[PDB]
Amino acid sequence: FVNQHLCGSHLVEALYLVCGERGFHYPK
Amino acid sequence: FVNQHLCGSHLVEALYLVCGERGFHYPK
Amino acid sequence: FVNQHLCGSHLVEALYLVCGERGFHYPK
Amino acid sequence: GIVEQCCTSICSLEQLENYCN
Amino acid sequence: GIVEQCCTSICSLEQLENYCN
Amino acid sequence: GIVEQCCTSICSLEQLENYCN
Ligand SMILES: *C(=O)COCCOCCNC(=O)COCCOCCNC(=O)CC[C@H](NC(=O)CCCCCCCCCCCCCCCCC(=O)O)C(=O)O
Ligand SMILES: *C(=O)COCCOCCNC(=O)COCCOCCNC(=O)CC[C@H](NC(=O)CCCCCCCCCCCCCCCCC(=O)O)C(=O)O
Ligand SMILES: *C(=O)COCCOCCNC(=O)COCCOCCNC(=O)CC[C@H](NC(=O)CCCCCCCCCCCCCCCCC(=O)O)C(=O)O
């Protein structure tokens, strides 16, 4: 499903989208 | 008004919404 | 073009908008 | 810290407003 | 770290899901 | 740092572009 490296802000965008209304913690 | 704990990204979303065009600083 | 200081979250919003689909790294 | 007030406890709008520019 | 898994390598949804609240 | 250039001073688009991936 993921076919890209997720660097810098891209990883934060991914977590935002994946986690939805749950929210997330980052980078720890 | 606030009835939820605001953990991880949720706190950043809250500050984004509360502070509007002023912007904000976080976590310090 | 830039006529404002970009402090706190404002700098992150600026980088988000400027960098588009490339994404960005911050603050380093 | 703001993380503490607002994740461990429940914080108010005014407490959040203190972090606006 | 998650930065490592997902920027250096390719990570899966499930790996990302481990960071959700 | 970019924080310095752009909060203390006024920075240009090109200065911001240096931080894009
Ligand atoms: C290091 O800490 C040593 O390890 C032992 C002690 O620490 C353990 C972990 N640290 C803790 O503080 C305790 O955590 C316990 C678990 O808590 C639950 C998870 N939360 C955290 O871990 C909190 C850590 C915290 N912050 C983060 O991780 C979150 C940072 C996320 C930033 C990016 C979010 C961006 C959100 C974007 C929203 C913008 C909306 C735009 C809308 C416009 C839409 C439109 O106009 O249409 C931390 O400080 O590290
Ligand atoms: C530690 O520093 C020791 O203490 C003494 C010296 O330091 C004092 C404080 N630190 C300073 O650097 C000086 O600060 C002075 C006060 O300045 C004003 C406030 N600014 C700061 O404090 C700057 C600190 C800085 N950064 C932050 O705090 C801000 C980080 C925010 C990240 C999260 C923002 C997310 C924004 C999301 C936007 C996404 C848009 C999406 C749109 C899509 C919409 C659609 O498609 O529809 C720092 O580096 O710490
Ligand atoms: C210090 O590190 C010592 O220096 C030597 C070693 O380190 C070198 C640099 N550090 C590295 O880890 C290696 O970097 C190599 C270069 O990699 C490429 C660039 N990436 C990084 O540098 C990664 C650093 C990383 N993270 C960041 O910089 C990125 C943090 C960005 C946070 C803010 C992004 C917010 C995104 C908002 C999206 C929200 C979407 C909302 C949508 C709602 C829309 C609607 O509803 O309509 C790090 O951990 O530092």
Author numbering:
A (entry chain B), B (entry chain B), C (entry chain B): 1 to 28
D (entry chain A), E (entry chain A), F (entry chain A): 1 to 21
Tell me what the authors wrote about this structure, in their words.
Elimination plasma half-life of ~20 h in dogs and ~70 h in man is achieved by a strong albumin binding, and by lowering the insulin receptor affinity 500-fold to slow down receptor mediated clearance. The crystal structures of these low-affinity insulin analogues were determined to assess the effect of the substitutions and addition of albumin binders. The crystal structures of OI338 and OI320 shows a conserved insulin structure with small differences compared to the human insulin backbone, with root mean square deviations of 0.37 Å (OI338, 44C(alpha), Cα atoms) and 0.56 Å (OI320, 41 Cα atoms).
